[PDB]
Design a protein around this ligand. Structure first.
Ligand code: MG
Ligand code: MG
Ligand code: MG
Ligand code: MG
Ligand code: MG
Ligand code: MG
Ligand code: MG
Ligand code: MG
Ligand code: MG
Ligand code: MG
Ligand code: MG
Ligand code: MG
Ligand code: MG
Ligand code: MG
Ligand code: MG
Ligand code: MG
Ligand code: MG
Ligand code: MG
Ligand code: MG
Ligand code: MG
Ligand code: MG
Ligand code: MG
Ligand code: ZN
Lengths: 77, 119, 48, 134, 178, 177
RNA sequence: UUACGGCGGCCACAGCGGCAGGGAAACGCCCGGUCCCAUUCCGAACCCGGAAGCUAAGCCUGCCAGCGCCGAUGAUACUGCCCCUCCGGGUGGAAAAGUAGGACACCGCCGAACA
RNA sequence: UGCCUCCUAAAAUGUAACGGAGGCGCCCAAAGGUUCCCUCAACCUGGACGGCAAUCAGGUGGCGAGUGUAAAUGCACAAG
RNA sequence: GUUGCGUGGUUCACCGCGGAGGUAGAGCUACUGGAUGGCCGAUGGGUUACUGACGUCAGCCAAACUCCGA
């Protein structure tokens, strides 16, 4: 038969996506949304990360918002 | 028009720098606006957008300064520094307003530095 | 064509930094000012 | 009817659920065949129905096919076990839903057009009916 | 002080008054700049342009030119990005004025079989483009110390809002037309 | 003259609409000159009868809870399979206002030589006031040579009615064979 | 308080475009490049020095739905859970599109005259 | 046969098949850091060689360009 | 899974509130493609019955399409 296994490979699922949702209390350094590119943008008190990870600079509550079209994640202390 | 292109480019430049430089209650934005004629400056603290101090080369005490726009910029620099002291502010972030650092803007910034205000 | 080249501090000869480089793009033995912990300061770290 | 190119040569089967939401009324002609059940309608079926129309009218009027068989259906070679890859596409199919208008006629004569349209429905793997432009 | 300019203020400005009824004194069009471009395709071969198309305009326009670099790649033209493919100068001010003045005075009427050049060449907004085909148009460059002959293509960009007034001001400056 | 009597929907929704359409009613909404939309149930058979006649416009006099008012059908949701009316959306008319309305176009006359005359758009949008002096627009063609297609211009628009759809829409095309 | 000047919120219901009107301070164009600084050439820009000229343009105001944008209600599609052979039905949710319409933004912080 | 990207994958994550598609086993001494500046493609109009498409000028153009390299997510505030 | 020792309501259900979504559906002059019929018309083709780019008017389609969107 035809050896049509020309496409049978894939990479590992990288477990992307939002890790801490709105109104959820987090500590500083705790990653909020791990993603490719800037699907979400760092808001107030949120750092970006070398691989666009959007961590918390400070403890407090996660909140999502819009900043001139760009959708952003911030922490309110 | 040339005026429209200048105004759009200058807004673009100042938005560019404004992405990183914000200014707060403890250390505000000392933002400049020089025309061909005058230079105004105002200390913003844009967490609520409340200008805590302001100065310009429009009032007679800066108008009557003997000398050119360098001197009328150092005058307004010392003036904004002294009323920043009066408002209770000693450290700010300096916003070029989109213009090149140098000339009358740098003269204003240096005058504001030399007498207490410490960006 | 991209070998691993080690950088040695010019003062204490301490081979500190390993990196890569294109031999054809720059045949000569390159130099960078790197921080030397033994000297406690930045000095030239030329290849070995 | 053959797509002159397709971005994805091996697709999943098109999904046959729901009433057609677009192409539901007669839009160009004044008579239409409208489907009343789901089916994949092949390009051969479409062509055979079209020939049935046009050589029942022989002349005059005109025929619209507001259905295009651009969805490929693959086929493993005849004598093969399961699972050595997807088969090569060989059927070209249009996903027709109940309510989709498949063919339209404009014809000055009423009965000839109606008989031609039923002649085409008899060519189709589907229950259909003649509907008009109100 | 360029004499064509002094006479520009002397009569052409008020002539543009008497011809077009501009409501405000600054509506009056003026030549904003003059762009002289080489467009050399014969540099992608053997990359000779310096003493041919630089030291000529250094004496012609009086200002050292920009080497306009390639922007995309074309196989039919054997050109890649990042090759000198043009040479440009943008002239403003009194020196641009003196350049047009010298051109009309002792340079332009010297081109061979010249009888005035097309007035329809406008682009619809009020800018003008044409070309030349020999360096000896200017006294400043001699023929015993130059290479093969070339030419320059000139845009003259004015503040005119449309072609009739652009052409009007070009005529008042002294450009020949047929 | 086009009298129709409805009732107000005591409840709207999926089950309520299905119950009404089993009972033979038709759900509908009145919305007009800034008024709060009314949520009512048309007779069904009677509504389907009124717009067989006097066009599909068929400006209706509605009797909602005794009080008389004037409605005009604006949207008509018909089921694809049963071809029955599922919903009606209606407006109001205060004895004359330039409401935009889509009105059918018919053709009269025969083409002499070997010609195919095709109809493309069934209906044109026109501006009309209250009780519709305008009706289906007639294209009186005498069967001209198939090299003269007739657009929205040179049309038989009646007085008091304007056509602002576009003076470039072709409705009937004439070609060979 | 103004057809004024100044910095943000917000990112089209705000945009874009069209048509008018505006120059007291101001914003601007504007006049120059001895004077810091600048052009991958150009004092165009950037920067500096000025106030002969001007609201033509930017800007501001007002009016336009034109190009766009927002957009219900209802209905439908779809659907969680039930009941039921599907078709279906009950119940809880409920679009997209379209329609009625909305809309030529709104709000916040100092100076000039006024007052 | 390991790794990366997408779809399958049923709107968190994850999810199989000898399911559907591609890439990788590098490159860059700048293509890294930082500071500052800029905006593209395409289209239209005019222009010596030059043409549909080389460079030029003016418009229009908010991203249809570009991104070292697959795809996705991003990036015009630019990451171009 | 069981069982010992700890911990103690942290589990789970329902109600409310705060959140991310791109499936169903739908839409596509919102992109990338597929694609039906008109009308105009660059080209090409033998002055032009032949071609019909691009647009424009309508109707559509998609796991690897998405202005949207349960
Ligand atoms: Mg993956
Ligand atoms: Mg890294
Ligand atoms: Mg090198
Ligand atoms: Mg559809
Ligand atoms: Mg004034
Ligand atoms: Mg100047
Ligand atoms: Mg004006
Ligand atoms: Mg609704
Ligand atoms: Mg909607
Ligand atoms: Mg998932
Ligand atoms: Mg899921
Ligand atoms: Mg491989
Ligand atoms: Mg670098
Ligand atoms: Mg960059
Ligand atoms: Mg255990
Ligand atoms: Mg919730
Ligand atoms: Mg949700
Ligand atoms: Mg997807
Ligand atoms: Mg679907
Ligand atoms: Mg397309
Ligand atoms: Mg076509
Ligand atoms: Mg989808
Ligand atoms: Zn050392």
């Amino acid at each position: 038969g035809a050896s049509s296994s020309r496409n049978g490979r894939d990479s590992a699922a990288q477990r992307l996506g939002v890790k801490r949702y709105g109104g959820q209390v987090v500590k500083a350094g705790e990653i909020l949304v791990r993603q490719r590119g800037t699907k979400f943008h760092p808001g107030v008190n949120v750092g970006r990360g070398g691989d666009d990870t959007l961590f918390a600079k400070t403890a407090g509550a996660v909140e999502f918002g819009i900043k001139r079209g760009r959708k952003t994640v911030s922490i309110v202390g | 028009s040339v005026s429209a292109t200048r105004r759009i480019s200058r807004l673009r430049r100042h938005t560019r720098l404004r992405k990183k430089l914000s200014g707060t209650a403890e250390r505000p934005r000392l933002v400049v606006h020089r025309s061909a004629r005058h230079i105004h400056v105002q200390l913003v603290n844009d967490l609520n957008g409340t200008t805590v101090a302001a100065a310009s080369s429009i009032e007679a005490d800066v108008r009557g300064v003997p000398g050119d726009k360098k001197a009328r910029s150092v005058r307004v620099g010392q003036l904004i520094a002294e009323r920043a002291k009066a408002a209770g502010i000693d450290t700010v972030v300096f916003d070029r307003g989109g213009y090149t650092y140098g000339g009358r803007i740098a003269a204003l910034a240096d005058a504001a530095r030399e007498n207490g205000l410490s960006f | 064509v991209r070998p691993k080249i080690t950088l040695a501090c010019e003062v204490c000869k301490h081979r500190n930094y390993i990196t890569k480089k294109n031999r054809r793009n720059d045949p000569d033995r390159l130099e960078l000012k790197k921080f030397c912990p033994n000297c406690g300061k930045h000095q030239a770290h030329r290849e070995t | 009817l053959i797509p002159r190119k397709v971005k994805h040569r091996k697709q999943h089967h098109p999904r046959q659920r729901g009433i057609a939401s677009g192409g539901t009324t007669v839009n160009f002609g004044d008579y239409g065949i409208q489907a009343l059940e789901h089916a994949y309608v092949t390009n051969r079926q479409i062509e055979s129905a079209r020939i049935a129309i046009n050589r029942h009218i022989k002349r005059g009027g005109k025929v619209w096919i507001n259905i295009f068989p651009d969805r490929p259906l693959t086929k493993k070679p005849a004598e093969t076990r399961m699972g050595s890859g997807k088969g090569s596409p060989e059927w070209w199919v249009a996903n027709v839903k109940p309510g989709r208008v498949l063919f339209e006629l404009s014809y000055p004569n009423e009965g000839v057009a109606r008989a031609a349209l039923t002649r085409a429905i008899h060519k189709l793997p589907i229950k259909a009916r003649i509907i008009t432009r109100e | 002080q360029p004499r064509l300019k002094e006479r520009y203020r002397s009569e052409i400005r008020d002539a543009l008054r008497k011809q077009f009824g501009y409501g405000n004194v600054m509506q009056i069009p003026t030549v904003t700049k003059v762009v002289v471009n080489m467009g050399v395709g014969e540099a992608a071969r053997d990359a000779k342009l310096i003493n041919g198309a630089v030291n000529d305009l250094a004496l012609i326009t009086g200002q050292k030119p920009e080497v306009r670099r390639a922007r995309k790649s074309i196989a039919q033209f054997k050109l890649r990005e990042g090759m000198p493919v043009g040479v440009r100068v943008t002239l403003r001010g009194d020196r641009m004025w003196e350049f047009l003045d010298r051109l009309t005075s002792i340079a332009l009427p010297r081109i061979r079989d010249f009888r005035g050049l097309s007035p329809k060449q406008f682009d619809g907004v009020g800018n003008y483009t044409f070309g030349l085909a020999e360096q000896a148009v200017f006294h400043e460059v001699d023929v015993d110390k130059i290479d093969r002959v070339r030419g320059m293509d000139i845009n003259v960009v004015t503040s005119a809002a449309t072609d009739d007034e652009g052409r009007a001001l070009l005529r008042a400056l002294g450009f020949p037309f047929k | 003259s086009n009298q129709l009597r409805v009732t107000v929907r005591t409840e709207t929704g999926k089950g309520a609409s299905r119950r009404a359409r089993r009972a033979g009613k038709i759900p509908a909404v009145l919305y007009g000159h800034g008024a709060e939309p009314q949520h009512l149930e048309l007779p069904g058979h009677d509504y389907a009868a009124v717009l067989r006649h006097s066009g599909t416009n068929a400006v209706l006099t509605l009797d909602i809870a005794g009080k008389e008012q004037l409605a005009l059908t604006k949207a008509l949701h018909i089921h694809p399979i049963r071809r029955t009316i599922q919903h009606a959306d209606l407006l109001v008319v205060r004895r004359g206002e330039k409401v935009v309305v889509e009105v059918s176009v018919v053709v009269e006359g025969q083409a002499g030589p070997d010609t195919l005359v095709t109809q493309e758009t069934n209906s044109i949008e026109i501006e009309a006031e209250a009780l519709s002096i305008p009706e289906q627009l007639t294209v009186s063609i005498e069967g001209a040579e198939p090299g003269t297609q007739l657009t929205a211009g040179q049309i038989a628009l009646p007085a008091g009615v304007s056509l602002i759809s576009d003076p470039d829409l072709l409705v009937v095309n004439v070609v060979k064979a």
